[PDB]
Amino acid sequence: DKEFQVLFVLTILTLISGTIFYSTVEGLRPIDALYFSVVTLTTVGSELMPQTDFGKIFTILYIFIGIGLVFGFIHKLAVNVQLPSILSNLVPR
Template sequence: MLRLFTLLTTLPLIVLTGTIFFRLVEGWSWLDAYFFTVVTLSTVGYGSLVPVTALGKIGTTIFIFTGLGVFALTIQQFAAFAMRKREQHTEKLMGITARGAVHESPSDAANTDESAPG
């Protein structure tokens, strides 16, 4: 859980850093810098914005490797968290079923003390 929390706080910091970097280096608007950052992290890559400066291109490659790694880890940890919650819910339901349900066959009902002769 702590790892997921750490990743969920790291990811916005990476988006913020990328947005500031592209705003300063490429001279894009805040919206364009943010859009490029998110599109790059998500690997969609529309191509509507492309870094033109050498520093922007180098920064983009570094950003892709670090940001994509954190993005992928965040998704993986979120999926693992969701699966654990689902397993816990299933185990809880199975425990309720095991304790609360009566599984009798018709022959078991006929062989109870009430039906035994006197």
Template sequence: MATLWLGLVRLLAGFRRGLRDPEFRAILFLLAIAMTGGAVFFHAVEGWQWIDAAYFSAMALTTVGDATLSPTTAIAKIFTMLFSISGIGLMLAFLSRLSTFRERYDDRKDQE
């Protein structure tokens, strides 16, 4: 259990450190725009509740997927394909930058 907490502390410290980096903030902003845009689209086109639309957007961007929700209209299916292809790259860029700042945090702790 201690390892889990230590990992979360390191992750949050890396996130905090990343917020000082303009590139990290830009990626985070674009990710927020993608999540919001996806939620608005799915709410409007599919008629889903806001929480379901946001949930599906997160699932599509992280490649987790969920069989309980799926687009039913042709335009929503096309949007989901394009949304996922472009958004997955954005999510990978975010996670890559986050891991860089987490590693820097670990390196500094080892030097102390």
């Protein structure tokens, strides 16, 4: 599935981009910048809110582009990896 591979790579690149942005512009530790990016694009949300106007505008754009990529990856992960794995693990052998 080349669609799954592309969504995987773009999701990785997206989370790297957010990690770099929030550590640089919002001053977060990289691990906190990564956490922020993940919980934002999965729509879980965080206690942390961007403090700068640049962070706020970026996050708006990051949200609209990133949700579609991340949930596209999550759907393909479920269908192509997790579902076949569960089915295989339910087979009596």
